[PDB]
Design a protein around this ligand. Structure first.
Ligand code: MG
Ligand code: MG
Lengths: 192, 190
């Protein structure tokens, strides 16, 4: 039966606004989980230019504690968007026994971003490494800032889709804007 | 809490071998291996039997995984399943090779053909029953189907090796490349 190690990878770019929309997403997604050492564990990493572990997989042992922490996460911002670095760091550091990962438990990564990555040339390798380590990946593309800035989103969407596990349609979410993020909580939760 | 001995048919008809090592990797990487947790030993048989490694040879999952990938196919024409199972019972499951007193013994048998020492199965299996060894048996029908051979008799033989209820302990795998698909389910039942 179930058991789950979930690491949410958050793009802290300034373009994402309002930040309340992201924390609302975290709250609504996480409150529907049974969090504990013998159940689901959640770890959160935020990236911009560099990466920060907001908290490890075994930092909190109850849904209640996680919800309190999730709300405290502040937007770190950043010039460049290093999604490959964020994902790779999550694989290499977040999903390790030292930080709480559990032997034999299913691994799930949830990536939320609102732009193409400056280190997109690393994605091919980074994604394959996650795949070899059996990390199911759900990727979320927020088209808000791009649309508000009249930027074509075609390539952006293609890039974020490439991060999602197959079948893509089930692991990739095209979110029109920040305020619409909480809208996918029900579905994402049913698929994780 | 578990002493697991995997008994692998090494007969040349099984192809590609990477399919068997992929199965081992995927199955073993989900276990917590150690002298205080799960222990794994592997035996490979053909016309003869070889202990790839004893139950207490390794004390961690990572070590087991590195060793598992190194296991080479030894081949053979004769499929001495009875000998393989019997050797696992009286040799692999001994305190000398790492077996822990009081821990549950689990055997996982993987083969792609009827055994040439089939006349010994009833006796060998009964001895396993007497010693309380839970048995999971996996029949790969790859070579048989490719060779257009009937599989009814083959499947019945492998089912007879599995502990009851057969539904829980026996697995019918269409071909080598499909072996990896039972890892999840097998891992949950052990
Ligand atoms: Mg941005
Ligand atoms: Mg054979």
């Amino acid at each position: 039966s179930t058991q789950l190690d979930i690491v949410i990878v958050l793009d802290g770019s300034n373009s994402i606004y309002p930040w309340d929309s992201v924390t609302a997403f975290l709250n609504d997604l996480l409150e529907r989980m049974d969090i504990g050492p013998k159940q689901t564990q959640v770890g959160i990493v935020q990236y911009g230019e560099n990466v920060t572990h907001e908290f490890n997989l075994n930092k909190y042992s109850s849904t209640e504690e996680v919800l309190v922490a999730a709300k405290k996460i502040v937007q770190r911002g950043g010039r460049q968007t290093m999604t490959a670095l964020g994902t790779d760091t999550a694989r290499k550091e977040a999903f390790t026994e030292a930080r709480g990962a559990r032997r034999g438990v299913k691994k799930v990564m949830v990536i939320v971003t609102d732009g193409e990555s400056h280190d997109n040339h690393r994605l091919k390798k980074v994604i394959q490494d996650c795949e070899d380590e059996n990390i199911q990946r759900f990727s979320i593309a927020i088209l808000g800032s791009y649309n508000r800035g009249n930027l074509s989103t075609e390539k952006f969407v293609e890039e974020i889709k490439s991060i999602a596990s197959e079948p893509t349609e089930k692991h990739f979410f095209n979110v029109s804007d920040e305020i619409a993020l909480v809208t996918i909580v029900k579905t994402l939760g049913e698929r994780i």
